Structure 1
Amino acid sequence: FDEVFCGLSNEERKKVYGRLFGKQVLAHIHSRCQRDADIIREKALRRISRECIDCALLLNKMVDILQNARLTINFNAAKIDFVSLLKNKEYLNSYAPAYNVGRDSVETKAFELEKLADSPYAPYGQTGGFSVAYTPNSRTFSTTSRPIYAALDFLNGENGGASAYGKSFFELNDNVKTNCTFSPFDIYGHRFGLDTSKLSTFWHMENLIASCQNDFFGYNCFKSLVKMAKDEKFLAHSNYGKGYEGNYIDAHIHGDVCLFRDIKHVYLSLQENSYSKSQLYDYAKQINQALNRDCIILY
Structure 2
Amino acid sequence: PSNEERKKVYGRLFGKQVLAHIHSRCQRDADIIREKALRRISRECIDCALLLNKMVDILQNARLTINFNAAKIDFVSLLKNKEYLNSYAPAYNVGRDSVETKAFELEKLADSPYAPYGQTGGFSVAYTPNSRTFSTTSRPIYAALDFLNGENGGASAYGKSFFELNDNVKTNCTFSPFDIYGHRFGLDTSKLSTFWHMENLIASCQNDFFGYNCFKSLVKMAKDEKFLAHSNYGKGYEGNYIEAHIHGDVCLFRDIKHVYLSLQENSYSKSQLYDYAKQINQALNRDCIILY
Report the Cα distance in structure 2 between the residues aligned to 1:129 and 1:164, rounded to whole angstroms: 29
Matched, 1:33 2:46: no
- Aligned-pair distance for 1:52? 0.5
Q: What's the C-alpha RMSD, in Å, of the aligned pairs?
A: 0.4
Q: Number of paired residues?
A: 291
TM-score, normalised relative to structure 1: 0.97
SS at match of 2:108: helix
The one-character-per-residue Cα deviations of 1:102-133 (angstroms, maximum 9, x if unpaired) are 10000000000000000000000000010111
Q: Does residue 236 of the first structure (1) align with residue 240 of the second (2)? A: no
CA displacement, residues 161-209 of structure 1 (integer Å, 9 cap, x when unaligned): 1111111000000000000000000000010000000000000000000
Report the CA distance between 1:242 and its aligned residue.
1.1
Q: CA deviation at 1:45?
A: 0.1
Shift, 1:243, TM fit: 1.3
Q: How far apart, CA to CA, are the structure 1 residues paired with 2:219 and 2:261?
A: 31
**What stretches of structure 1 of length at least 5 have no aligned partner?**
1-8
Q: CA deviation at 1:39?
A: 0.1
CA positional deviation for 1:252: 0.1
Distance 1:240 1:104 in 2: 27
Q: Deviations over 1:1-47 (max 9, x none)?
A: xxxxxxxx110000000000000000000000000000000000000
Q: What SS does structure 2 have at the residue aligned with 1:181?
A: strand
- Specify which of 38, 42, 46 is matched with residue 39 of structure 2: 46
SS at match of 1:72: strand
Return the offset for 1:94.
Answer: 0.3
Instruction: Provide, for residues 37-77 of structure 1, a one-character-per-residue CA deviation record: whole Å limited to 9, x for no partner.
Output: 00000000000000001100000000000000000000100
Distance 2:247 2:260 in 1: 23
Listed one character per residue, the Cα deviations across residues 250-296 of structure 1 (whole Å, up to 9, x for unaligned) are: 00000000000000000000000000000000110000001000000
Counterpart CA distance in 2 for 1:163 and 1:85 is: 18
Find out whether 1:16 has 2:2 as its counterpart. Answer: no
Offset of residue 86 of structure 1: 0.3
CA apart distance, 1:98: 0.3
1:196-232 deviation per Cα after TM superposition (whole angstroms, max 9, x unaligned): 0000000000000000000000000000000000010
CA distance in 2, matches of 1:242, 1:135: 31
> 1:165 and 1:22 mapped to 2: Cα distance?
24
Confirm whether residue 55 of structure 1 aligns to residue 48 of structure 2.
yes
| Match of residue 272 from structure 2 | 279
CA distance in 2, matches of 1:83, 1:268: 11
Task: Show structure 1 runs of 4+ deviating over 2 A.
Answer: none
Q: Distance in 2 between matches of 1:283 and 1:133?
A: 38
What TM-score comes out, normalization by structure 2 length?
0.99
